[PDB]
């Protein structure tokens, strides 16, 4: 009865989306000129870790980055000189995500311990200390992002995401409805909305100020492992074990384009956009990362010399370089 | 060349590198084990004998063990399973007593079948393709009482064997040993009465055999 109501809505709404669907990115972008053959070359190789690298993040300065690996250590790298600024020994070795505060004063990490740890980089004692132990989740931490110096959003295996107040240590908001391990999230540039992908083969856009999902995106055949916003914060792209990448338009509530190739059969671990958004980068379980033209949906150039699954990938804020982390305990800077 | 500030920064980075290498070398000595039970399996009993991941470490015969169990992780095991890929071995606890016990959810799911299927899924995983498995069949006293007065046919319909009991225990042991497609990977099984005190010895022997097998693989004697 109420289930039938939900179905009829799901039906009418679909008949309405198809209405706002006359053209396709391709048809509209069939006259733009191809980007070319992007040929990036490793410029730096960070080889300090001793185990699989599971996450990495760039600082807003576009020079320092933080990477987390299963050896229970966080490393702050100076990409320009390949120097190690800090080495943070993690209480729990099972870390699967890390984040860099936009101000650069804090770094957050989390993993299979179900808690998110916040580390203070600027201290009078000149050492990295754990400032807060955000422990409200039930499942493993999946992703973390800093809204500001005192707010952070996390995703876990509870099929839920939470917004935290670091000083208080309490979840100020909770986002439920993913019915599947939330596996990643991204923050819009306006910093008032964010999206998350889950194993339920759907991604939902959330309003941080309110706390409720506004738009739910579907049409993805398998789990979702990576999500990233378009530079203008008006669309986003998602990876998956389906071996396909896709981007959706917030104001269209629809899929815009699909990035899949017959030769490619494997999952996608991470996605990222170039500064202008013309280039979409995605790490693959095939040990390599491909580069896709944003509008033409063509693999501009394959780009990887990693020895195992490319776990994490990130483009600098200045767009100057792209860093790829893999399960071979190696980080490579491509330019 | 570089300025004094960069010289100092490079010296700090080199010190960090040396410390990191020393920590890694020190940590590489211990052996890591993954504990994978099933509900009411005797994994809790094994741990007692000695909210997220629970780590229990101990030293036996100048050897350091790190035993991890994911019990509070109610999420899908498909994810985060790859984390324990470079692990020395697995520990699997099946309750012999489960032979006659539909799962608590009463989905007509034979407790043992759920375990047989769970064991099959764990053994034939992409990761953990070469990780020897230590199998524990505890609650022999229970199995011992139930095996008499109730047939194993209920669990294994194609019993075709004597009802009691060591033979029944061999049927179930072999049924678990099956569905191991990969060669060069052995499953060590033990019968636990729930009050024995040599399970540490058995796990130590299994780990030493695994280490010996690994060392004979480097020599190329796969």
């Amino acid at each position: 009865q109420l289930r039938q109501e939900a179905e009829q809505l799901k039906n009418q709404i679909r008949d309405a989306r198809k209405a706002c669907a006359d053209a396709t990115l391709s048809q509209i972008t069939n006259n733009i000129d191809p980007v070319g053959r992007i040929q990036m070359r490793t410029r730096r190789t960070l080889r300090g870790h001793l185990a699989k690298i599971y996450a990495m993040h760039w600082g807003t300065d576009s020079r320092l980055l933080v990477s987390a690996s299963q050896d229970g250590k966080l490393i702050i790298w100076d990409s320009y000189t390949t120097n190690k600024v800090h080495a943070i020994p993690l209480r729990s070795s099972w870390v699967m995500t890390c984040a860099y505060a936009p101000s650069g004063n804090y770094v957050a990490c989390g993993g299979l311990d179900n808690i998110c740890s916040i580390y203070n980089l600027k201290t009078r004692e000149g050492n990295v200390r754990v400032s807060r132990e955000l422990a409200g989740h039930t499942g493993y931490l999946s992703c973390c992002r800093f809204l500001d110096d005192n707010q952070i959003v996390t995703s876990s295996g509870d099929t839920t995401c939470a917004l935290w107040d670091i000083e208080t240590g309490q979840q100020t908001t909770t986002f439920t409805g993913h019915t599947g391990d939330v596996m990643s999230l991204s923050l819009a540039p306006d910093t008032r909305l964010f999206v998350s992908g889950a194993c339920d083969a759907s991604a939902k856009l959330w309003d941080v100020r309110e706390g409720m999902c506004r738009q739910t995106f579907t049409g993805h055949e398998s789990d979702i492992n990576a999500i990233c916003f378009f530079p203008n914060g008006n669309a986003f792209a998602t990876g998956s074990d389906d071996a396909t990448c896709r981007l959706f338009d917030l104001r269209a509530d629809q899929e815009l384009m699909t990035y899949s190739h017959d030769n490619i059969i494997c999952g996608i671990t991470s996605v990222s956009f170039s500064k202008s958004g013309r280039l979409l980068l995605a790490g693959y379980d095939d040990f390599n990362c491909n580069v896709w033209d944003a509008l033409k949906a063509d693999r501009a150039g394959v780009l990887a010399g990693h020895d195992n699954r490319v776990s994490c990938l990130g483009v600098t804020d200045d767009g100057m370089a792209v860093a790829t982390g893999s399960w071979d305990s190696f980080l490579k800077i491509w330019n | 060349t570089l300025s004094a500030e960069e010289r100092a920064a490079l010296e700090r980075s080199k010190a960090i590198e040396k410390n990191l290498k020393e920590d890694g070398i020190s940590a590489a000595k211990d052996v890591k084990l993954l504990l994978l039970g099933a509900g009411e399996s005797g994994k809790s009993t094994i741990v007692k004998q000695m909210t997220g991941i629970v780590e229990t470490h101990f030293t036996f015969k100048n050897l350091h063990f790190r035993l991890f169990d994911v019990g509070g992780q109610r999420s899908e095991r498909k994810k985060w399973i790859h984390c324990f890929e470079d692990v020395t071995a697995i520990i699997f606890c099946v309750a012999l007593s489960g032979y006659d016990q539909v799962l608590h959810e009463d989905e007509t799911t034979n407790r043992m079948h759920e375990s047989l299927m769970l064991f099959d899924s764990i053994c034939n995983n992409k990761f953990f393709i070469d990780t020897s498995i230590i199998l524990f069949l505890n609650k022999k006293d229970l199995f011992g009482e139930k095996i008499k007065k109730s047939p194993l046919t209920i669990c294994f319909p194609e019993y075709t064997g004597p009802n009691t009991y060591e033979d029944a225990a061999a049927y179930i042991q072999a049924q678990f040993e099956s569905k191991n497609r990969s060669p060069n990977k052995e499953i060590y099984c033990h019968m636990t009465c729930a009050t024995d005190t040599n399970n540490i010895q058995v796990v130590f022997d299994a780990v030493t055999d695994i280490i010996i097998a690994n060392n004979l693989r480097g020599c190329g004697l796969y």
Partner: single-chain antibody, 233 residues
Framework: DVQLVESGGGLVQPGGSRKLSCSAS????????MHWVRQAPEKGLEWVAY????????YYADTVKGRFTISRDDPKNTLFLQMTSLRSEDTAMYYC??????????????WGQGTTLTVSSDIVMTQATSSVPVTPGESVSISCRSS???????????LYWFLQRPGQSPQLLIY???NLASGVPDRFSGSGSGTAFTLTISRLEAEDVGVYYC?????????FGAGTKLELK
Amino acid sequence: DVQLVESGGGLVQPGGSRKLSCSASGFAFSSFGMHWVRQAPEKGLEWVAYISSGSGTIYYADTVKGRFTISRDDPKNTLFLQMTSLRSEDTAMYYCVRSIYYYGSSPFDFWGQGTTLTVSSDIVMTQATSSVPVTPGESVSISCRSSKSLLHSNGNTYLYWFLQRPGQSPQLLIYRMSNLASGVPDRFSGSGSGTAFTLTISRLEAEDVGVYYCMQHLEYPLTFGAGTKLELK
């Protein structure tokens, strides 16, 4: 919290030997490089010695070489300076300064209270002025000059500014002639070319009266300019 105390000074006849030490507490002493800075009884600041964080790098001044040795014992969080064949001009005031070197660091951020001692080429920073007549509520600028350009190929000009209020230890104000030390009023502002540097003080008050020193960290030995003093006409 963080503080450095040193006490090894006293009346020493010329040609003798003495040992100086400052105990470090409230911070990770083992992770900081330590410096010794000497100030003559009348005026002036001059670098003395430096020992790296891992005690793998050591430097000395010309006169310090061959007579002074710098040692540290991280377990006991203590810094040591050994004096031999002390000269009559060696009588001065000694400070031990912490300093940590990594990307975006603030070396020379904390200074000790110091210990007095009595007895009986290189870059030339040039703080031309020696006294500046000023009144509260009006701006003031102090300029520092260097012999060679401090702008490294990195893009960082290693120029530092310190304030030493009367009767108290000097404190870091600006590092790299563009950054502001933590817990420093925003009115301070450092800027300049690769060879000339200046400061801007807005709405000056009686609390800023003192002497300012500009130091270069481009290469050893570290050099200080004479100071520029402020008054209250």
